[PDB]
Design a protein around this ligand. Structure first.
Ligand SMILES: Nc1nc(-c2ccc(O)cc2)cc(N(Cc2ccccn2)Cc2ccccn2)n1
Ligand SMILES: Nc1nc(-c2ccc(O)cc2)cc(N(Cc2ccccn2)Cc2ccccn2)n1
Ligand SMILES: Nc1nc(-c2ccc(O)cc2)cc(N(Cc2ccccn2)Cc2ccccn2)n1
Ligand SMILES: Nc1nc(-c2ccc(O)cc2)cc(N(Cc2ccccn2)Cc2ccccn2)n1
Ligand SMILES: Nc1nc(-c2ccc(O)cc2)cc(N(Cc2ccccn2)Cc2ccccn2)n1
Ligand SMILES: *[C@@H]1O[C@H](CO)[C@@H](O)[C@H](O)[C@H]1NC(C)=O
Ligand SMILES: *[C@@H]1O[C@H](CO)[C@@H](O)[C@H](O)[C@H]1NC(C)=O
Ligand SMILES: *[C@@H]1O[C@H](CO)[C@@H](O)[C@H](O)[C@H]1NC(C)=O
Ligand SMILES: *[C@@H]1O[C@H](CO)[C@@H](O)[C@H](O)[C@H]1NC(C)=O
Ligand SMILES: *[C@@H]1O[C@H](CO)[C@@H](O)[C@H](O)[C@H]1NC(C)=O
Lengths: 213, 213, 212, 213, 213
């Protein structure tokens, strides 16, 4: 009930309920099924690209959501949603497999827990990757391939599900960038290695971009 | 009253009361209305500026207020205000939407709590932004916009409001800066996304400045 | 039982068990024998190189395993493995003896504990080293040696066992790098000092690489 | 009693007593008057100077004292002083008002507590400032001024006093700097703002220096 | 004895005894005499040398030992040594008096505690220094002096004593550095200031090095 959203004690009790139920270190696997983690990046900017090193700086909003039904409550007469520090929640152990720098999180480390058990988490992140930035000054542009998946959970435990959607890019990418976006695709992928046969699901995010002009 | 300001025991007890009552993770919505958060940036210095890449590096005192009547106390014969570590208080989850570096806090992380429940928090912050830097070498100057709002609380839950609409920050801006501030305007602004319909309020700050001839 | 892998309560119970049993600060020596730690670096990228100062800046996945049998459980009808924050576990105090920068860990700091007591830990690390960069612009390439071993545990306490394989890390190394890996090999070595006769085992990693 | 300094049990007991009595978050006012804080900067090095940007990068020892006579003990047969982590103590919430970078503390964060309740704190700090570097390469030199005061406590609560008005920091400043110090002067003022009537005290440090030749 | 070194229960009990007994914030003075701290820097690399600014950036292993007999135990049929997190131990508050950057620790922060109560601690540290760099390009090389001592403990509480006085660090220094070490000498030194009477002991490390030709 949105009318009850600003009931302070209601919010405090939901938070208390969330923290009691939450097992921040245990994957929330409903029904003997992998946790489905939906992710999609919204690029905000492309910063220091170096063609002498093949490195780029990106800023993106990591739209991330999953379900934990044990967190659900009755919101007939209480807030529909509250904000919760992620230290009180299980959060998927996502990583950019091919990153070359730490994720620099630029935003308050809070998620939204919806009364149905849905969790929404969208950090703004600056991070460096190794990219093919050779044709960045040409009309065909450059490509970054960013791969994001669970660092330690294989596909029986965590499933990673991407959403490619370029229509709303305009709402996100800075208009003052040295660069423009030709194309973003975010595709579901599976990773295996010679040593280790189990499949790890990831989103492969392809950023095709070039200098304006 | 200010005759009792330096009563050590009083301050200690006020701090104790604040801590017992304070819920650092719950928005202090009094009645059933959004928390009104007032924000005003006083710019202190423009350190670096890149016209080619449209980035700025600035220092600013972020004057921040809101009130939590539950923290209030009768101060006829006690301190009117004390200093409180913000780890003991709720603070709004503000983020600069077009920031490209972590805000670097340069000051003790303390807030002032007033006996009427008003909270004042003014961190000195250094941070980088993507904004319009063109015109910096002209008489008219560049106009750089900085949008700041709550990261996770929509307008039903938090309202952001600019304190001052203008100023030049002459009481604040360094006289030794290679730049000079022409004007600073602060404006209420609203943001929505086509994925997510609820409105998030923000203050949009416009910094009109230029290089010294 | 992999069919039980997703039994949430099972997982939570395993984790609680692991935490009750685990001594994060004590080496898990079994049968009064040294802890065998297998290490394996998989290079992700080589970022910058200075032939004048003999420095390299690299990113690598450090494949690390060891056993702690006291953590073992019967998985007849429960998960085969769980993820565990390494703050809850003993991890070997490994260091690169020729690092000239701090190990910048890029990944979530978790290990896998397997029901037989096996622990797998694989941080992605960016770090700078001092090593031989001569020949980086020749077709033989440079050969940069990186030495990693325990910082405080001598060889009767921790033994380091380099493993397979011999490869150019093709499944791992970025194709977008300005460098190519010719070869990566690993070798067991030992270190002693005239102040300190006890032997410290290390893996010696030889990175043979050149500029494109 | 200096004969008793190395009595371990005594030291431990003193530290226990200090921690039991200490209120790290409460200003140690005595007799309902402002905490008197003595501050003095001993400059060690001037690293980088930029006359275009008016920035300096310096290293100094911040000599800092104040009294909390509640920490005092009878040292007739016990150590005169002990070292205490400052997290176990109240420390003034000092900040450089014209700092453009975080204070980098280079030394163990320890204070000395004296049996008479005197507290001595001296971090080595490297920090960048916005100040006057006009004339760095003249024989008269540049006079860079730094203001340091409490961030959240007005003059009725904390008073900040320079210690020795003038020296040339002979026993401190690196003989290997490419700059030389002509004079350092430290004087009281106060700062007020039209928004905020109450007065904040600070020490204003004037650093007169030039490049050697 | 070493045949019991891998007795896990024993190690655990030793670590438990050490933690029960240890006072990490109190100097381990025995016999009411100053704590004897032995220090020697083994240099690993000389990364950067600046002759215009007289700065030096090095990596060294700070070999450090002292004794706390209260930690001792009977090792007839138990381990002779264990590794201990330095957070559980008292460590001397050492600082480089001419450091201009924070000591960056590159190694696990663990010490060895021997059953006779000796403590060994050897962090690899990367740090920057202001020191005399003139002559680095000559045959005689540069002699860069580094002074390390307790930050808050004077001569009656802590005595710093150089271990080896002369070495070329040939077992430690990288063969791959562009510099080479002619000699490393370490001398006991003492330091006082006009403001403050009592003496502070330190080790003067003279690093005589030059560019390879
Ligand atoms: N553009 C946008 N996208 C999402 C989102 C999130 C998850 C997802 O799977 C898909 C979309 C959420 C979202 N907001 C809410 C929210 C929730 C949590 C953290 C942060 N924010 C609103 C919002 C407005 C303004 C600034 C930041 N967030 N805004
Ligand atoms: N110029 C100025 N503005 C404010 C202020 C704060 C919040 C707000 O909404 C509007 C104005 C407070 C303020 N001071 C007090 C205070 C209080 C809290 C934290 C920090 N400081 C005085 C002050 C002087 C000098 C250095 C820092 N603070 N000074
Ligand atoms: N290539 C690879 N190697 C290993 C590995 C680990 C230890 C060892 O001794 C040898 C090899 C494990 C491993 N994964 C599992 C795991 C486990 C623990 C932490 C992290 N990851 C799968 C995996 C795929 C992709 C991204 C991260 N992990 N992948
Ligand atoms: N030159 C100097 N000045 C002071 C000092 C401090 C406060 C003050 O108001 C005036 C002078 C203290 C002091 N030492 C003692 C002390 C005490 C506490 C922390 C740190 N140090 C001795 C000392 C020697 C050498 C390296 C560091 N300290 N040395
Ligand atoms: N060369 C060397 N010197 C020392 C040492 C230590 C203290 C001292 O006063 C003098 C010398 C100890 C030492 N090791 C053991 C130890 C113990 C503790 C921490 C770290 N290391 C062996 C060792 C081998 C290899 C890599 C690191 N340590 N190695
Ligand atoms: C809780 O939800 C149930 C399910 O619709 C409903 O029957 C009940 O009235 C709700 N509780 C209230 C409104 O207090
Ligand atoms: C509290 O109530 C009023 C102030 O609103 C005042 O008249 C009264 O004396 C106060 N009592 C106290 C401070 O104990
Ligand atoms: C555990 O393992 C034993 C054999 O080691 C097996 O017989 C028993 O059924 C198992 N118990 C469980 C899974 O509870
Ligand atoms: C402190 O103790 C000594 C003896 O223990 C005594 O002589 C002295 O008077 C005491 N001082 C006070 C203030 O009690
Ligand atoms: C204690 O030490 C003595 C001699 O050092 C030895 O005989 C005895 O066995 C030891 N007792 C233990 C380790 O319990």
């Amino acid at each position: 009930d949105y009318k009850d959203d600003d009931d302070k004690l209601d919010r405090a009790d939901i938070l208390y309920n969330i923290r009691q139920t939450s097992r921040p270190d245990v994957i929330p696997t409903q029904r003997d099924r992998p946790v489905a983690v939906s992710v999609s990046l919204k690029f905000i900017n492309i910063l220091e690209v170096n063609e002498i090193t093949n490195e780029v700086d990106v800023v993106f909003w990591q739209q991330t959501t999953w379900s934990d039904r044990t967190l659900a409550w009755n919101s007939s007469h209480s807030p529909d949603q509250v904000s919760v520090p992620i230290s009180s929640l299980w959060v998927p152990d996502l990583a950019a497999y091919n990153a070359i720098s730490k994720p620099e999180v630029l935003t308050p480390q809070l998620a939204r827990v919806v009364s149905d058990g849905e969790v929404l988490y969208m950090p703004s992140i600056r991070q460096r990757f190794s990219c093919d930035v050779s044709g960045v000054d040409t009309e065909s542009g450059a490509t970054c391939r960013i791969k994001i998946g669970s660092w330690t959970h294989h596909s029986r435990e965590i499933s990673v599900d991407p959403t490619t959607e370029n229509s709303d890019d305009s709402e996100y990418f800075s208009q003052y960038s040295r660069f423009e976006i030709l194309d973003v695709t975010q595709k579901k992928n599976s990773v295996t290695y010679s040593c280790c046969p189990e499949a790890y699901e990831d989103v492969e995010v392809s950023l095709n971009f070039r200098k304006k002009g």
